[PDB]
């Protein structure tokens, strides 16, 4: 099965490797270091798990990632940016990207009080559009003509962030009993 956890420096080589496999936009290892050592609570990864290039440990290997930062160019209120997002093709269409993205959105607010978040996404990329526009409810801020190296336009997307809206308990059901934390799991 697929596990979902925070990112650490020990994932960035495999994050880079997933990026190189899944996207035409690629960065050098220093850029990933710059991310994980600047916002070490913002990025998350998806791995396989075995219980009792992308290989981190025996059995565990990275199938997805969400690379996240805060805007550090000014002068606006604190905002975030989704730098990159991939999920190896064999593990797509399962809700991995949603889980990564939802965690990262909550992180950006909870940790860095980001009042909104931006990203760039190709026009022709149907899967990516559905995720941001449909599943996650992002507004199209703009069109960016000839953004990518191959010449393709981009949608500049944006989402406003409020802490209680973004809590991971809110999206537990696709279509309602909770855990109150107070005892007990023996009832």
């Amino acid at each position: 099965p697929i596990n979902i956890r925070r990112a650490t420096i020990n994932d960035i080589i495999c994050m880079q490797n997933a990026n190189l496999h899944n996207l035409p936009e690629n960065y050098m290892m220093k850029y990933y270091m710059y991310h994980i050592l600047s916002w070490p609570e913002a990025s998350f990864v998806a791995t396989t798990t075995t219980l009792d290039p992308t290989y981190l440990a025996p059995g565990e290997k990275l199938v997805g990632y969400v690379l996240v930062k805060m805007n550090d160019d000014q002068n606006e209120p604190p905002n975030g940016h989704i730098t990159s997002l991939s999920v190896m093709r064999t593990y797509r269409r399962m809700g991995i990207a949603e889980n990564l993205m939802r965690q990262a959105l909550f992180a950006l607010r909870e940790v860095h009080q980001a009042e909104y978040v931006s990203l760039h996404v190709r026009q022709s990329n149907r899967a990516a559009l559905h995720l941001y526009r449909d599943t996650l409810a992002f507004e199209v801020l703009s069109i960016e003509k000839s953004y990518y190296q191959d010449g393709e336009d981009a949608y500049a997307m944006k989402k406003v962030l409020k802490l209680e809206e973004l809590q991971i308990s809110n999206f537990t059901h696709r279509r309602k009993l909770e855990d109150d934390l107070e005892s007990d799991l023996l009832e």
């Binding site: 996207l23 936009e25 960065y27 940016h81 996404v121 990518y148």
Partner: peptide
């Protein structure tokens, strides 16, 4: 996907 071109 952020583009790092210049």
């Amino acid at each position: 996907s952020y583009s790092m071109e210049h």
